[PDB]
Amino acid sequence: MRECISIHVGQAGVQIGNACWELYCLEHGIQPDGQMPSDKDSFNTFFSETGAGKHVPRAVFVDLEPTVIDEVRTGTYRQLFHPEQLITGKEDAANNYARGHYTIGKEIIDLVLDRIRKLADQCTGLQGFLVFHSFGGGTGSGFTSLLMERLSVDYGKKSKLEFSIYPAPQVSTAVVEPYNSILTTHTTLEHSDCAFMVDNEAIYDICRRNLDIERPTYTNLNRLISQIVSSITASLRFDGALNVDLTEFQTNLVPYPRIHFPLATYAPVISAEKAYHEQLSVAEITNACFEPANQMVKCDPRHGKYMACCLLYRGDVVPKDVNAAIATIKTKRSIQFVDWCPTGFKVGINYQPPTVVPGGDLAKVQRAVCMLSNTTAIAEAWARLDHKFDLMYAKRAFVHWYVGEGMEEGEFSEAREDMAALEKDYEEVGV
Amino acid sequence: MREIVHIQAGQCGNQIGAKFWEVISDEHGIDPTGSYHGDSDLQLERINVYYNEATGNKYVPRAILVDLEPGTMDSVRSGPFGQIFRPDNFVFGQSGAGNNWAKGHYTEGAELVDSVLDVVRKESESCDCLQGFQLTHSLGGGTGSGMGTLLISKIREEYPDRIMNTFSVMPSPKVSDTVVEPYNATLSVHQLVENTDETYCIDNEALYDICFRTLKLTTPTYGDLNHLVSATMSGVTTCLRFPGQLNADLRKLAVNMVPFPRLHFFMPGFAPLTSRGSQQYRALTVPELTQQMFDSKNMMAACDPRHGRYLTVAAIFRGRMSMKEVDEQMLNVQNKNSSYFVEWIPNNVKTAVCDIPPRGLKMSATFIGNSTAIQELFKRISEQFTAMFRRKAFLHWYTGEGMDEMEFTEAESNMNDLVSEYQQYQDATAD
Amino acid sequence: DLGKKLLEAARAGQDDEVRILMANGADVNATDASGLTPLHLAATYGHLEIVEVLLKHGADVNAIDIMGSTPLHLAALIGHLEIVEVLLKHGADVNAVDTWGDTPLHLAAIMGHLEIVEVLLKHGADVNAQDKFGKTAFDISIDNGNEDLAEILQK
Ligand SMILES: Nc1nc2c(ncn2[C@@H]2O[C@H](COP(=O)(O)OP(=O)(O)OP(=O)(O)O)[C@@H](O)[C@H]2O)c(=O)[nH]1
Ligand SMILES: Nc1nc2c(ncn2[C@@H]2O[C@H](COP(=O)(O)OP(=O)(O)O)[C@@H](O)[C@H]2O)c(=O)[nH]1
Ligand SMILES: [Mg+2]
């Protein structure tokens, strides 16, 4: 196999990673103590093995404050991870990109690399890293951008994928979150090969609409996010022919290195209270992949053009029914590919139904689908973020907090200007 | 970000500071001897923020008591909680200040400032991870104004990376008709704009108007005024003392409330307004708490928010209530009063909910606002300062202690520049 | 020069020294470098007994300094109610104007001396008197939001 190391930065990256690794164990059949009964490899990309038969995740948890990681050190899966891979500081970045990148982040950046090096030396064929972090947090933005620069120097030919959390005012914690999201994007744009953005507002509205959760919490959001991250990384952990390694993620989803932000859509999402629902067909869940309500980022792909589209099915799915669903969707919907790409749809099928976590809000389904697509409509997400950035930066609001922590004010302009060039990268492709 | 060192200086500082410890000790379930008598684990979650753990099950406040007059030392020990304060933390000089800002800042207080710093270092080094300092004082007197600002400068140059917070009491002729108080207040504000991170303006003019016109108290006393202060200080520190989100620490609060370094003077609000032992307010709901929190009659500073524009707003709700209802009411006021919020700071309103309400109440709401309307307080003190300074009245009291006459002019020029800075962003548009 | 000693004696409130200096021919209407008379300093520092004995010995109750300040201006500013009633009893100009356009009513309204405001109004203080910036005593109450001062000026 080719191993994969997952990196979890900040509160958002740690709590989402905790929910993901709980789901990974229930999918592979791994007990919370790391023991897996005589199962019959592919799962070894995410799990190493000790001499006693213990399956330990290839994961690193980093945070500048210990409150969130201390929950993992005492939680249900506390005996699953290596204790030395749970790294904690004492004072967080205070929602300041400059603290996580320049001042506070430097005091622990070397220790994180030496711990990552220990997992790297254990691998026989390391292919890349998975980085989980938020955009708004000082650690998720400042420390992540710092870590991505170091990984490009010490690991030259290794891939790097991101699971980034897009800020949403419903469940946001800082007014300077638009600042940090722009600063971390400009500094990580050249060091990241493919980034899957998760809009908190999209996941928030899905929980209220489909799951009937009046006021969703971080628990409700993370369980749904982990259910989507699993469908994206299932091809790396199980047998298949589509997106079998990190290099294939770039080949299938990213035609040009700067536009490496694919859009993810998931279906079906059904509340657990409706255990006796009707099993939606392959054609029903495929048509739901083109509705804006099921997308992980709030945007309208009908207003953009397609450069790539992948379909990862899970469960009772007959391949002949997928082709009939694509032929109908090709002629029914207004799906416009760019003039320089083949209008084909890549299909991968895993014949196991998705695994639900006990205590979750999702019901069991016989078939589910996750579509990964690269459409120019995702530039709308950058446009809303750039508008909040320009409103505050015109008056230089909150800027003194950043320049007081080693950062220079000129970095604000070079980052915003890079976003303007990134916005025109989508316009030059699909007008 | 955990422990906070408390410091109280002067007559007003020790009076409002003693009431602060009496109120929060009843909320955490601490008797006058220091033994925990509560019945909730949340009372001991964040108790290390304001208390030090003694030998037994005793919690000692992290408070430092300073004053030039020895008389107030006897008044603190006469209080119900005078024995829980550390006898090592009592620093009292020989002669008072005599309502002279120069005696506390240059002569009498400059000799006593070294003995306090030794207590600050002894208290700060015993903290596992010091967060900052909070100071309670008045600005119209001599010690809390003169030595209070001197102690801030001496402590800040030794702890520059920490947070300096102040609860400053503004003078008013309605309560104390001492004509040299506009002198001491203006000289203090000249220091607060440079040496503090967060300053809560507790205006005696507003406290008097609330007791006289709303509470129907024809002869308001300091006990009636401090009842509003202690209730406000307990509310603004709710999330520093309980398992909370929103800010949770002083720096994250400062990043989300201070858009410009000089504009760090907050307008406290509170609702409902009850007398001492009256227990009158009862049928108070969520829509009414949100209404009164943004009303001029519930502001602890004599400033009408309708006259200016909000830069940042933080609200802390206390009691058993609906998170969905609090969110619907906060969004409604932001839409109803959208003309009173600046449009170039998106999502400038932070909302908080705490399940533990204060003593004698089930519903409570504390308002922390950074409004441009606070200039009406600074223009009121400046007008009284200019009326006195243009006649050179009692100027020999200050020059006789070593002050130069230019210190009054440069202090008069700073607050006028501060008022022009509030009016600057009050008229600014996003365009 | 007994004029300089009478100035300092009126400041420190030495009643015995003021009576003796006047007995030796001291100028009751002497002025300092800024034009302050012994009646100015006695009314500023709240020495009522010295204000009384000065007015009975040829003191000019309406004297002005370099900046046009009368004894009534400084008494209304510092807030000496008993001195204000004594000065008005000896013919002090209730509507005297200094170099800033301020009247005794302006200074009492600004400093919050509410009882002195009522006394000045009862003695004929001009409510329409504007300062150098057009503000009257009623304008200062509105701009500062002083409702008790506003109602006093409305009678
Ligand atoms: N979906 C999801 N989002 C989260 C979670 N925790 C935090 N966030 C988001 O992350 C953003 C803030 O970043 P954080 O991760 O909390 O901050 P941090 O990475 O710990 O960095 P610091 O500023 O130093 O605390 C907010 O917009 C939150 O909405 C979580 O558990 N799940
Ligand atoms: N709200 C309130 N204000 C006070 C109290 N005591 C004094 N003050 C105010 O503080 C000012 C006097 O300053 P003070 O603190 O007594 O002088 P210091 O001892 O040199 O600090 C006056 O304007 C009072 O209005 C009090 O208990 N409560
Ligand atoms: Mg953090």
Coordinates of N, CA and C and ligand atoms in Angstrom, one line a residue, chain B residues 10-12 15-16 67 97 99 138 140-144 169 171 175-176 181 204 207 222 225-226, ligand 2:
Chain B
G10 N -7.6 53.1 45.4 CA -8.4 54.3 45.8 C -9.6 53.9 46.6
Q11 N -10.4 54.9 46.9 CA -11.6 54.7 47.7 C -12.7 54.1 46.9
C12 N -12.9 54.6 45.7 CA -13.9 54.0 44.8 C -13.6 52.6 44.3
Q15 N -14.2 50.1 47.0 CA -15.6 49.9 47.3 C -16.2 49.1 46.2
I16 N -16.1 49.4 45.0 CA -16.6 48.6 43.9 C -15.9 47.3 43.7
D67 N -4.1 51.6 48.2 CA -4.7 52.9 48.5 C -3.6 53.7 49.3
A97 N -4.3 61.2 49.0 CA -3.9 61.9 47.8 C -4.6 63.3 47.8
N99 N -7.6 64.2 46.5 CA -8.2 64.5 45.2 C -7.3 65.2 44.2
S138 N -11.5 54.9 40.2 CA -12.2 56.1 39.7 C -11.2 57.0 39.1
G140 N -11.9 60.6 39.0 CA -12.0 61.9 39.6 C -11.2 62.2 40.8
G141 N -10.7 61.1 41.4 CA -9.9 61.2 42.7 C -8.4 61.4 42.4
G142 N -7.6 60.9 43.4 CA -6.2 61.1 43.3 C -5.4 59.8 43.2
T143 N -5.7 58.8 44.0 CA -5.0 57.6 44.0 C -5.4 56.7 42.8
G144 N -6.7 56.3 42.7 CA -7.2 55.5 41.6 C -6.9 56.1 40.3
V169 N -14.4 54.5 36.8 CA -15.6 55.3 37.2 C -15.4 56.7 36.8
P171 N -16.2 60.7 36.8 CA -16.8 61.6 37.8 C -18.0 62.4 37.2
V175 N -23.0 63.5 41.7 CA -22.6 62.6 42.9 C -21.5 63.3 43.7
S176 N -20.5 63.8 43.1 CA -19.5 64.5 43.8 C -19.2 65.8 43.1
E181 N -12.2 67.4 39.7 CA -12.3 66.0 39.2 C -12.2 66.0 37.7
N204 N -20.7 57.8 36.6 CA -21.6 58.1 37.8 C -22.8 59.0 37.4
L207 N -25.3 56.4 36.5 CA -25.7 55.6 37.7 C -26.7 56.5 38.6
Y222 N -24.0 55.8 47.6 CA -23.0 55.0 47.0 C -23.3 53.5 46.9
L225 N -25.5 53.1 44.0 CA -24.7 53.2 42.8 C -23.9 51.9 42.6
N226 N -23.3 51.4 43.6 CA -22.4 50.2 43.5 C -23.3 49.0 43.2
Ligands
LIG2 N1 -20.0 54.6 41.9 C1 -19.2 55.0 42.9 N2 -18.4 56.1 42.8 C2 -17.6 56.4 43.8 C3 -17.6 55.6 45.1 N3 -16.7 56.2 45.9 C4 -16.2 57.3 45.2 N4 -16.7 57.4 44.0 C5 -16.4 58.5 43.0 O1 -14.9 58.6 42.9 C6 -14.6 60.0 42.9 C7 -13.6 60.2 44.1 O2 -12.4 59.5 43.9 P1 -11.8 58.6 45.0 O3 -11.8 57.1 44.5 O4 -12.7 58.6 46.2 O5 -10.4 59.2 45.3 P2 -9.1 58.2 45.5 O6 -9.1 57.6 46.9 O7 -7.8 59.1 45.4 O8 -9.0 57.2 44.4 C8 -15.8 60.8 43.1 O9 -16.2 61.5 41.9 C9 -16.9 59.8 43.4 O10 -18.1 60.1 42.6 C10 -18.5 54.5 45.1 O11 -18.6 53.8 46.1 N5 -19.3 54.2 44.0

